[PDB]
Ligand binder design. Structure first.
Ligand SMILES: Nc1nc2c(ncn2[C@@H]2O[C@H](COP(=O)(O)OP(=O)(O)OP(=O)(O)O)[C@@H](O)[C@H]2O)c(=O)[nH]1
Lengths: 50, 427
């Protein structure tokens, strides 16, 4: 309503809103401490999670 | 020069021969093919303790395989390193094992011992001067026992001046699968102890307990167990091939460990086995190394030495160490449990410090100690043998093969003598 009121009464062109928000990057998940040599390259993954 | 030739016997002598040789080859950077890819000058320099050197830089492992059923030999053959093994050494017979100690000791071996002896003395002549031979077999396993008893018996007179190092798997006390296993064990142990000087006792249950405890992986393969035991053996092997302050000699260990003529049976233990998050959750300090190093749970041979004490102990450590930390930890362990050792020889501990680390982790070690930790094992086998023999079941097979029970009597007699000797010395 404001930006259509201005376009005729005060005769105002377009003024789009500007994103005034604040942002942050994302983090990353914990990976696997590499193959110790004593385990299994696929089962030790499931084992060493939580 | 000092060097060693390997013998793998039985259908688990296969097991471990495969795993052990492949582990060493990966340590030394030899490809699965054989073309040496030199990256560690020292191991290139001292490869001769195990390996001859062939053209173009491949190295025969001076190891010999013995079995009866060609399928297992072909399977290990098919393994990633059967090509680095020998068509030369691939001697084998035609019969079926029958899992029969009697047949193995009298029928089947009677046409294989000849050829295998020819091969082994061929290799002995080929090389300069052995320290001896390491033989990997089973005591409960039928044909492994049947072969190995006769083989060691003959090589005893063949060379009375070398190291007959033997490695044996103890039957799971909870189950032997094969029900004649106690009979095979009582048959074997007599000649085993009579002929050998040093014997390694290992049991499957404790390795399974380790797998639950720190491996925590819940999906183990006997191959993973073999991976462990290969590292175990490598631990005591590293000394000879490596420089720095360390008494490497197996005869050194023998004269520092073996108090009496007939004490031979020893129990292993090893150093950091890294868990799920201990990789980044464990600080590698001599205190914690010794802490886990001398622990009941990490022990994996037979049964908790909580009941008994330790006659004598020996420990070798791989990495950049110094004497003060091992010294002070020795003081602490002596002053902590003044009773838990035998007064029979004060300061019953031996140390060794390999300068060379393993490839990937900084500090490792090997434990080996002689204790009163076999009483329960052979008393167990005593009750089993007595209970099954009192009605002489499963014995007509052996009568057909040509046995009699007087040898059973003398076997159990010698074994009870071992019990009595242990008890009277320590207790
Ligand atoms: N590589 C390998 N070895 C095994 C495995 N499972 C058990 N073994 C053990 O290895 C033992 C020893 O085998 P051998 O020394 O070849 O015994 P044998 O005189 O040839 O005759 P058997 O006792 O009937 O096998 C067997 O009794 C098994 O208990 C496995 O899954 N893989």
């Amino acid at each position: 309503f404001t930006r259509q009121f201005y376009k005729d009464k005060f005769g105002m062109p377009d003024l789009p809103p500007v994103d005034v928000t604040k942002k942050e990057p994302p983090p990353v998940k914990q990976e696997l401490p590499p193959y110790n040599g004593y385990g299994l390259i696929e089962d030790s993954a499931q084992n060493c999670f939580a | 020069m000092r060097e060693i030739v390997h013998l793998q016997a039985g259908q688990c002598g296969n097991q471990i021969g495969a795993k052990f040789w492949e582990v060493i080859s990966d340590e030394h950077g030899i490809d699965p093919t054989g073309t040496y890819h030199g990256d560690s000058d020292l191991q290139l320099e001292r490869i001769n303790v195990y390996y001859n050197e062939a053209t173009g830089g491949k190295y025969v492992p001076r190891a010999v395989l013995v079995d009866l059923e060609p399928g297992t030999m072909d399977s290990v053959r098919s393994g990633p390193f059967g090509q680095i093994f020998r068509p030369d050494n691939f001697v084998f017979g035609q019969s079926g094992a029958g899992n029969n100690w009697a047949k193995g000791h009298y029928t089947e071996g009677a046409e294989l011992v000849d050829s295998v002896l020819d091969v082994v003395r061929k290799e002995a002549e080929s090389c300069d001067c052995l320290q001896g031979f390491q033989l990997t077999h089973s005591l409960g396993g039928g044909t492994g026992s049947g072969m190995g008893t006769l083989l060691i018996s003959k090589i005893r007179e063949e060379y009375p001046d070398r190291i007959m190092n033997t490695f044996s798997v103890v039957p799971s006390p909870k189950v032997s699968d094969t029900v004649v296993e106690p009979y095979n064990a009582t048959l074997s142990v007599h000649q085993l102890v009579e002929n050998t000087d040093e014997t390694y006792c290992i049991d499957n249950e404790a390795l399974y307990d380790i797998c639950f405890r720190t491996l925590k992986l819940t999906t183990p393969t006997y191959g993973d167990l073999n991976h462990l035991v290969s590292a175990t053996m490598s631990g005591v092997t590293t000394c000879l091939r490596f420089p720095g302050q360390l008494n490497a000699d197996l005869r050194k260990l023998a004269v520092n460990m073996v108090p009496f003529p007939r004490l031979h049976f020893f129990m292993p233990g090893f150093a950091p086995l890294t868990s799920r998050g201990s990789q980044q959750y464990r600080a590698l300090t001599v205190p914690e190394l010794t802490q886990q190093m001398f622990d009941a749970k990490n022990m994996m041979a037979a049964c908790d030495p909580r009941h008994g004490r330790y006659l004598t102990v020996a420990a070798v450590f791989r990495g950049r160490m110094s004497m003060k930390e091992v010294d002070e930890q020795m003081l602490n362990v002596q002053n902590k449990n003044s009773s838990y050792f035998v007064e029979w020889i004060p300061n019953n501990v031996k140390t060794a410090v390999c300068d060379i680390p393993p490839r990937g982790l900084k500090m490792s070690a090997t434990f080996i100690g002689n204790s009163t930790a076999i009483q329960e094992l052979f008393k167990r086998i005593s009750e089993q043998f007595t209970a099954m023999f009192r009605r002489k079941a499963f014995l007509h097979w052996y009568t057909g093969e040509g046995m009699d029970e007087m040898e059973f009597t003398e076997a159990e007699s010698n074994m009870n003598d071992l019990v009595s000797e242990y008890q009277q010395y320590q207790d």
